[PDB]
């Protein structure tokens with residue numbers, strides 16, 4: 262039972278910070294180029310869109326943001342340390358494939374997210390379909 | 401109507417709030433645009449299409465037909481912009497936004513709290529469960 266289990270991490274590119282959330286069971290990702298207020302905002306707007314019940318991070322930075330805890334409490338997210346970067350260097354390759362189609366890094370990040378979530382291998386389901394499948398199976 | 405959406409704008413506290421509605425489910429996506437249209441709308445649409453099936457976006461004025469960036473995003477992501485929109489849920493949303501406004505320093509935070517409530521509440525099924533139900537019923541169909 263991992264419908265609402267997510268992984269949260271940072272990555273960096275062109276001197277900017279990319280927050281990345283991974284739905285662990287599906288591989289589905291959401292990201293944004295941005296501190297604690299920013300992380301809390303990102304988590305709230307994630308949690309309004311998917312079932313978000315547990316978020317795992319692997320360092321201490323999110324345990325020291327008062328707004329992040331406030332977001333956790335408001336939305337009912339347990340923020341837990343540990344495990345339930347192949348994804349960040351998979352996201353970075355795609356960002357590289359597209360970087361010249363957009364003026365802003367923002368945009369190239371979101372095109373890369375698009376491709377990651379929509380792409381297949383050939384057959385089966387994309388990450389975007391799996392997360393919907395997982396959730397639909399759930400209720 | 402799996403990938404059918406309608407896009408509209410609302411205003412609070414001197415700000416603009418882009419609001420995307422998945423017509424069949426009532427599920428909504430919103431964001432406080434710092435500016436007004438243009439590359440803000442194109443970015444919002446690209447994010448949206450990276451998350452959901454977005455095939456047809458309906459609007460009922462001419463504003464989005466005059467943005468080259470919006471047109472570039474429609475064609476990058478495979479979204480047909482279509483005019484006409486044949487409901488009152490900017491109304492609802494601001495109702496919830498008022499219920500929570502004192503819980504957030506920033507209007508955008510309070511908008512996103514309103515989206516949360518609208519999508520999760522009921523009863524039977526919430527908008528958030530329906531859009532998933534509708535989409536999962538479809539992949540297997």
Ligand SMILES: Cc1ccc2oc(C#Cc3cccc(CN4CCN(CCNC(=O)c5cccc(C#Cc6oc7ccc(C)cc7c6CC(=O)O)c5)CC4)c3)c(CC(=O)O)c2c1
Pocket residue numbers: 298299301302303305328331332335362363364365366367368369434439440442443444446469472473476503504505506507509510
């Ligand atoms: C083919 C194609 C397709 C798509 C395309 O698209 C584009 C584009 C674009 C673009 C154009 C212009 C501009 C920008 C970015 N612009 C926007 C505003 N940006 C301010 C951020 N500002 C906070 O993020 C912020 C600021 C302050 C506060 C917070 C917060 C919070 C918060 O959250 C909470 C959650 C829960 C709880 C309990 C509390 C909180 C709180 C605290 C509270 O409230 O109590 C957040 C700056 C940058 C982007 C292109 C063109 C291309 O590229 O070729 C393109 C091409």
